[PDB]
Design an enzyme around this catalytic site. Structure first.
Site, short mmCIF file in Angstrom:
data_model
loop_
_atom_site.label_atom_id
_atom_site.label_comp_id
_atom_site.label_asym_id
_atom_site.label_seq_id
_atom_site.Cartn_x
_atom_site.Cartn_y
_atom_site.Cartn_z
CD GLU A 72 -2.38 -5.54 10.81
OE1 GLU A 72 -3.05 -6.05 9.90
OE2 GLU A 72 -1.22 -5.10 10.64
CG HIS B 10 -5.57 -4.28 6.57
ND1 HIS B 10 -5.48 -3.60 5.37
CD2 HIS B 10 -4.34 -4.22 7.14
CE1 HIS B 10 -4.24 -3.15 5.22
NE2 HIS B 10 -3.53 -3.51 6.27
CE1 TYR C 273 -2.57 -4.11 1.72
CE2 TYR C 273 -0.91 -5.80 1.32
CZ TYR C 273 -1.36 -4.70 2.05
OH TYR C 273 -0.62 -4.22 3.09
CD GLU D 159 -0.81 -1.15 4.37
OE1 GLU D 159 -0.17 -0.53 5.23
OE2 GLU D 159 -1.49 -2.17 4.63
CG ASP E 272 5.31 -3.00 -0.20
OD1 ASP E 272 4.77 -3.87 0.52
OD2 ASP E 272 5.13 -1.78 -0.03
CG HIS F 255 3.33 -1.75 3.36
ND1 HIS F 255 3.31 -2.94 2.67
CD2 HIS F 255 2.47 -1.90 4.40
CE1 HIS F 255 2.47 -3.77 3.27
NE2 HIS F 255 1.95 -3.16 4.32
ZN LIG Z 1 -1.64 -2.82 6.44
#
Ligand SMILES: [Zn+2]
Ligand SMILES: [Ca+2]
Ligand SMILES: [Ca+2]
Ligand SMILES: [Ca+2]
Ligand SMILES: [Ca+2]
EC number: 3.4.24.27
Length: 316
Positions: A143, A146, A157, A166, A226, A231
Site C-alpha cells: 500500500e 502505491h 490504474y 500492481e 478489475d 491484479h
Molecule cells: Zn495494489
C-alpha cells in the site's frame, strides 16, 4: 499533536510483542516523530469517514485485541519508511518526508486495504477470508508503495500500466518483507489470508499460475473486469521479477538470478527515472534494461538476466 516523544509496547495482529514510537500529551498517541514529518495512525471506529481520530491510549500499553491492527499499521509503516530511506535514499513516499497516515478498523468485516490518494486504509477482514490486513508486512508495504508510484511514475490504474503499478507494489512489498526478515517469501498476503487454511496466499510471485494468474504474456487477461485485470496481469511482471532475482528456467528460457538487492535497485531506478503514466509492458522491459545498463554496464550479467527474464514471460 504537540508532545513528548516516547516508546510504548503492544501486541500485533499475530500476537507478537513489539515496541512502537508514540507521543505523550495527556494521552499517549500513535504518532511517531522519529521518522520524517511523522507517522500517524487513526481509529476509523468501524465507520467509513476518514481519517477518523488520532489513536489515543491512556497508558502507552497496547495489548487489547482492538489495539492490534493499530500496533501493526503503525509499526510496519515505520519499517517501510526505513527501507526506502536506508536502501534507496528516499525520504517518505514523496521524497520530501511527507507525513504517513493510516486508519484502521475501517468499516465492518472489510476485506480490503487501500491507498486513497492521501492515506492508507485498513479493514479488519471478515475473519474468514482475511484477518486485520495491517498484520501483513507485505500488505502494508504494498500500500505505501502505491503512494510512491503515485508521486513518481504515476502509472494509470488501468490495463497494462495498472498491472505494472500492481506488480511494483508486490515487488517492493516483498522486498520490504525480506528487509524486515519476517518469515520472508515470494508469496503475497500469506500472514493475513484465510486463517483457517495454512500454506496459501492471495498471490504468488514465484508461481502466479498456482492461483490462476498468468505467468506468460500469451495468457494475459484482455477483459474489462478489475480495471483491465490489474491484479491478474501483474502475475506476468511478478514472475519476471522473481526470475531476475532467483533465476530459473521458465517456458524453456533459462535465467541466471542476480539477487534481491540488484532487483530492487533496477526496478527502483526504472520507477523513478524511466516509467511514465502510460507505460506498457514493452516499455517496462526497455526501462528495466536501461536501468540495469546505467548501473552495471551494457555487457553485464545483470543486463543479460533482465533480458532473459522478460523473454521468459513473453514480453518483447
Ligand atoms: Zn495494489
Ligand atoms: Ca492501553
Ligand atoms: Ca512471509
Ligand atoms: Ca509475503
Ligand atoms: Ca491462510
Amino acid at each position: 499533536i504537540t508532545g513528548t516523544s516516547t516508546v510504548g509496547v503492544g501486541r500485533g495482529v499475530l500476537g507478537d510483542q513489539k515496541n512502537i514510537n508514540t507521543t505523550y500529551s495527556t494521552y499517549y498517541y500513535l504518532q511517531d516523530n522519529t521518522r520524517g514529518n511523522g507517522i500517524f495512525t487513526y481509529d476509523a471506529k468501524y465507520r467509513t469517514t476518514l481519517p477518523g481520530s488520532l489513536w489515543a491510549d491512556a497508558d502507552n500499553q497496547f495489548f487489547a485485541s482492538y489495539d492490534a491492527p493499530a500496533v501493526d499499521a503503525h509499526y510496519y509503516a515505520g519499517v517501510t519508511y526505513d527501507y526506502y530511506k536506508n536502501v534507496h535514499n528516499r525520504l517518505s513516499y514523496d521524497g520530501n518526508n511527507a507525513a504517513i497516515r493510516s486508519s484502521v478498523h475501517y468499516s465492518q468485516g472489510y476485506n480490503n486495504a487501500f491507498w486513497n490518494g492521501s492515506q492508507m486504509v485498513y479493514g479488519d477482514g471478515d475473519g474468514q477470508t482475511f484477518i486485520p490486513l495491517s498484520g501483513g508486512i507485505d500488505v502494508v508495504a504494498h500500500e505505501l508503495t502505491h503512494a510512491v508510484t503515485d508521486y513518481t511514475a504515476g502509472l494509470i490504474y488501468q490495463n497494462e500500466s495498472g498491472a505494472i503499478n500492481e506488480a511494483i507494489s508486490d515487488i517492493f512489498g516483498t522486498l520490504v518483507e525480506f528487509y524486515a526478515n519476517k518469515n520472508p517469501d515470494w508469496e503475497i498476503g500469506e500472514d493475513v489470508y484465510t486463517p483457517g487454511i495454512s500454506g496459501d496466499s492471495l498471490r504468488s510471485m514465484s508461481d502466479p499460475a498456482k492461483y490462476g494468474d498468468p505467468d506468460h504474456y500469451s495468457k494475459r487477461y484482455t477483459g474489462t473486469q478489475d480495471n483491465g485485470g490489474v491484479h491478474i496481469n501483474s502475475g506476468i511482471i511478478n514472475k519476471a521479477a522473481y526470475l531476475i532475482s532467483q533465476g530459473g528456467t521458465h517456458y524453456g528460457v533459462s535465467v541466471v538470478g542476480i539477487g534481491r538487492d540488484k532487483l530492487g535497485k533496477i526496478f527502483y531506478r526504472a520507477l523513478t527515472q524511466y516509467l511514465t503514466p502510460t507505460s506498457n509492458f514493452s516499455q517496462l522491459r526497455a526501462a528495466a534494461v536501461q536501468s540495469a545498463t546505467d548501473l552495471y554496464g551494457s555487457t553485464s550479467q545483470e543486463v543479460a538476466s533482465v533480458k532473459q527474464a522478460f523473454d521468459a514471460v513473453g514480453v518483447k
